[PDB]
Structures are given as structure tokens and as C-alpha cells.
């Protein structure tokens, strides 16, 4: 059970932190840099971000192809870290729209679409461009 | 990449 290991890591991280120690997982710093980069993006690029987010509205009927086509425009002539942050913020905005319209069910699906798009399209660029460690150093 | 968004300028 992946599940059981996760519960154990959560408890031990809590207990160590409660004693004034710090036991961070390898993806801890990546997560934090991404939250901060996404916040800064949405605050810096309100106009461009709105234009991005207005290009797609997710309904129970939407397929991945529709999401992929809009994200493909974002990366059509290649990848940079700024565009990767835009892709996260864009997913975020689609999830918020979904929940504003009481379609909470769509959040899971958007998460799977984002994970697929990362795996197929962005992870190979990231592994040739210094890994998520380079992102943390650039944005964290 | 060719700069098309304001965030491409920081790269």
C-alpha cells in the first residue's frame, strides 16, 4: 500500500516538526516554489492570464483533446519555465471555474489531464533543462 | 522560444 507509507510519512513528519526538527520529502521545495511562482504569475500577468483562462471552460462533456489543444498553443514553439508556471496557473483557474459552477467532480479530471500533459510533453524538456531543482533555484 | 507572452521575457 502506497497509502500506508504515505500515512506513515505524514505522521513521522508531523512528530519531528512538533519536536522542532525538519524532515522534508524530496518534492517539498518543488511544491513550495510552484505555489509561490503561481501566486506571483497570477499577480504579475492578470491580463495575459485572463486571456489564457477565457480560451477554455470545462464541462462534464469536455475531452482531454480540448484541454491539450489550448495548452499546445501555450507550448507550440517550445517550453520555458515561465510557460510551465502559466500551465499550472491555467489548470488552477479551470479547477476554480469548475468549483464556482458547483462541478467539483471535474477537479480530478483536470488533475489527470495536467499529469498526462506533464508526462508526455514537459518532463522530457525539464530533464534536459536542469530538472525541477533548476526551477527551485530560479523561482523558490 | 520566440517571445509571445509577457512571462517569456523573464526567460
Short mmCIF file of C-alpha atoms in Angstrom, two decimals:
data_model
loop_
_atom_site.label_atom_id
_atom_site.label_comp_id
_atom_site.label_asym_id
_atom_site.label_seq_id
_atom_site.Cartn_x
_atom_site.Cartn_y
_atom_site.Cartn_z
CA UNK A 1 0.00 0.00 0.00
CA UNK A 2 1.43 3.33 -1.28
CA UNK A 3 -1.37 4.63 1.04
CA UNK A 4 0.18 3.08 4.23
CA UNK A 5 3.69 4.51 3.50
CA UNK A 6 2.09 7.99 2.92
CA UNK A 7 0.20 7.82 6.26
CA UNK A 8 3.49 6.79 8.00
CA UNK A 9 5.49 9.65 6.34
CA UNK A 10 2.75 12.20 7.25
CA UNK A 11 2.74 11.10 10.96
CA UNK A 12 6.55 10.94 11.34
CA UNK A 13 6.95 14.40 9.57
CA UNK A 14 4.32 15.86 11.93
CA UNK A 15 6.02 14.34 15.04
CA UNK A 16 9.56 15.51 14.03
CA UNK A 17 8.24 19.04 13.18
CA UNK A 18 6.39 19.15 16.54
CA UNK A 19 9.83 18.49 18.23
CA UNK A 20 11.50 21.36 16.28
CA UNK A 21 13.23 19.14 13.66
CA UNK A 22 12.53 19.31 9.85
CA UNK A 23 12.10 16.13 7.72
CA UNK A 24 11.18 17.39 4.20
CA UNK A 25 10.26 15.00 1.32
CA UNK A 26 12.32 15.42 -1.94
CA UNK A 27 9.36 17.22 -3.69
CA UNK A 28 8.73 19.60 -0.71
CA UNK A 29 10.81 22.52 -2.08
CA UNK A 30 9.41 21.97 -5.65
CA UNK A 31 5.80 22.16 -4.33
CA UNK A 32 6.57 25.35 -2.38
CA UNK A 33 8.42 27.07 -5.30
CA UNK A 34 5.45 26.18 -7.59
CA UNK A 35 2.83 27.61 -5.17
CA UNK A 36 4.89 30.85 -4.93
CA UNK A 37 5.59 31.03 -8.71
CA UNK A 38 1.85 30.50 -9.47
CA UNK A 39 0.84 33.24 -6.98
CA UNK A 40 3.42 35.68 -8.48
CA UNK A 41 2.31 34.81 -12.09
CA UNK A 42 -1.42 35.47 -11.39
CA UNK A 43 -0.49 38.84 -9.72
CA UNK A 44 2.00 39.94 -12.43
CA UNK A 45 0.12 38.82 -15.59
CA UNK A 46 -3.58 39.36 -14.78
CA UNK A 47 -4.37 40.48 -18.41
CA UNK A 48 -2.47 37.66 -20.24
CA UNK A 49 -3.69 35.07 -17.64
CA UNK A 50 -7.38 36.10 -18.08
CA UNK A 51 -6.96 35.76 -21.92
CA UNK A 52 -5.45 32.25 -21.35
CA UNK A 53 -8.23 31.15 -18.89
CA UNK A 54 -11.02 32.51 -21.19
CA UNK A 55 -9.82 30.08 -24.00
CA UNK A 56 -11.43 27.04 -22.25
CA UNK A 57 -14.45 26.33 -19.96
CA UNK A 58 -14.55 22.67 -18.69
CA UNK A 59 -17.94 20.88 -18.69
CA UNK A 60 -18.61 17.19 -17.87
CA UNK A 61 -18.60 16.76 -21.70
CA UNK A 62 -15.04 18.11 -22.34
CA UNK A 63 -12.35 15.65 -23.58
CA UNK A 64 -8.57 15.93 -22.89
CA UNK A 65 -8.04 16.82 -26.63
CA UNK A 66 -9.75 20.27 -25.97
CA UNK A 67 -7.51 20.97 -22.92
CA UNK A 68 -4.40 19.68 -24.88
CA UNK A 69 -5.14 21.90 -27.93
CA UNK A 70 -5.18 25.08 -25.73
CA UNK A 71 -2.07 24.03 -23.71
CA UNK A 72 -0.46 23.11 -27.13
CA UNK A 73 -0.85 26.81 -28.15
CA UNK A 74 0.97 27.78 -24.92
CA UNK A 75 3.91 25.45 -25.86
CA UNK A 76 3.61 25.44 -29.68
CA UNK A 77 7.15 26.84 -30.40
CA UNK A 78 8.66 25.23 -27.28
CA UNK A 79 8.96 25.24 -23.50
CA UNK A 80 10.41 27.66 -20.90
CA UNK A 81 9.86 27.75 -17.12
CA UNK A 82 7.54 30.79 -17.42
CA UNK A 83 5.23 28.76 -19.71
CA UNK A 84 5.35 25.81 -17.28
CA UNK A 85 4.17 28.18 -14.47
CA UNK A 86 1.47 29.52 -16.86
CA UNK A 87 0.30 25.85 -17.47
CA UNK A 88 -0.04 25.21 -13.68
CA UNK A 89 -1.88 28.54 -13.10
CA UNK A 90 -4.15 27.73 -16.10
CA UNK A 91 -5.05 24.32 -14.58
CA UNK A 92 -5.68 26.08 -11.23
CA UNK A 93 -8.06 28.62 -12.90
CA UNK A 94 -10.01 25.78 -14.69
CA UNK A 95 -10.44 23.95 -11.32
CA UNK A 96 -11.66 27.21 -9.61
CA UNK A 97 -14.18 27.79 -12.51
CA UNK A 98 -15.35 24.14 -12.09
CA UNK A 99 -15.98 24.59 -8.31
CA UNK A 100 -17.56 28.11 -8.80
CA UNK A 101 -20.15 26.31 -11.06
CA UNK A 102 -20.66 23.51 -8.44
CA UNK A 103 -18.90 21.00 -10.87
CA UNK A 104 -16.32 19.88 -8.13
CA UNK A 105 -16.33 16.44 -9.89
CA UNK A 106 -14.19 17.98 -12.75
CA UNK A 107 -11.19 18.79 -10.45
CA UNK A 108 -9.96 15.11 -10.51
CA UNK A 109 -10.15 15.00 -14.28
CA UNK A 110 -8.24 18.34 -14.76
CA UNK A 111 -5.56 16.97 -12.34
CA UNK A 112 -5.22 13.76 -14.51
CA UNK A 113 -5.06 15.86 -17.73
CA UNK A 114 -2.31 18.09 -16.23
CA UNK A 115 -0.29 14.99 -15.02
CA UNK A 116 -0.60 13.39 -18.53
CA UNK A 117 0.45 16.64 -20.32
CA UNK A 118 3.46 16.95 -17.94
CA UNK A 119 4.44 13.29 -18.51
CA UNK A 120 4.15 13.35 -22.34
CA UNK A 121 5.15 16.95 -23.20
CA UNK A 122 7.01 18.78 -20.40
CA UNK A 123 9.01 16.16 -18.34
CA UNK A 124 11.41 15.42 -21.26
CA UNK A 125 12.22 19.19 -21.62
CA UNK A 126 12.57 19.51 -17.78
CA UNK A 127 15.08 16.57 -17.61
CA UNK A 128 17.19 18.27 -20.36
CA UNK A 129 16.94 21.76 -18.75
CA UNK A 130 18.29 21.11 -15.24
CA UNK A 131 15.37 19.24 -13.56
CA UNK A 132 12.86 20.61 -11.01
CA UNK A 133 15.98 21.56 -8.91
CA UNK A 134 16.74 24.28 -11.53
CA UNK A 135 13.11 25.50 -11.20
CA UNK A 136 13.52 25.70 -7.38
CA UNK A 137 16.79 27.64 -7.80
CA UNK A 138 15.15 30.01 -10.39
CA UNK A 139 11.74 30.60 -8.61
CA UNK A 140 11.95 29.19 -4.99
CA UNK B 1 11.42 30.36 -27.79
CA UNK B 2 10.04 33.12 -29.85
CA UNK B 3 8.68 35.65 -27.13
CA UNK B 4 4.76 35.55 -27.45
CA UNK B 5 3.70 36.16 -23.73
CA UNK B 6 4.83 38.75 -21.12
CA UNK B 7 6.34 35.80 -18.98
CA UNK B 8 8.64 34.71 -21.97
CA UNK B 9 10.76 37.98 -21.37
CA UNK B 10 11.89 36.67 -17.80
CA UNK B 11 13.37 33.54 -19.70
#
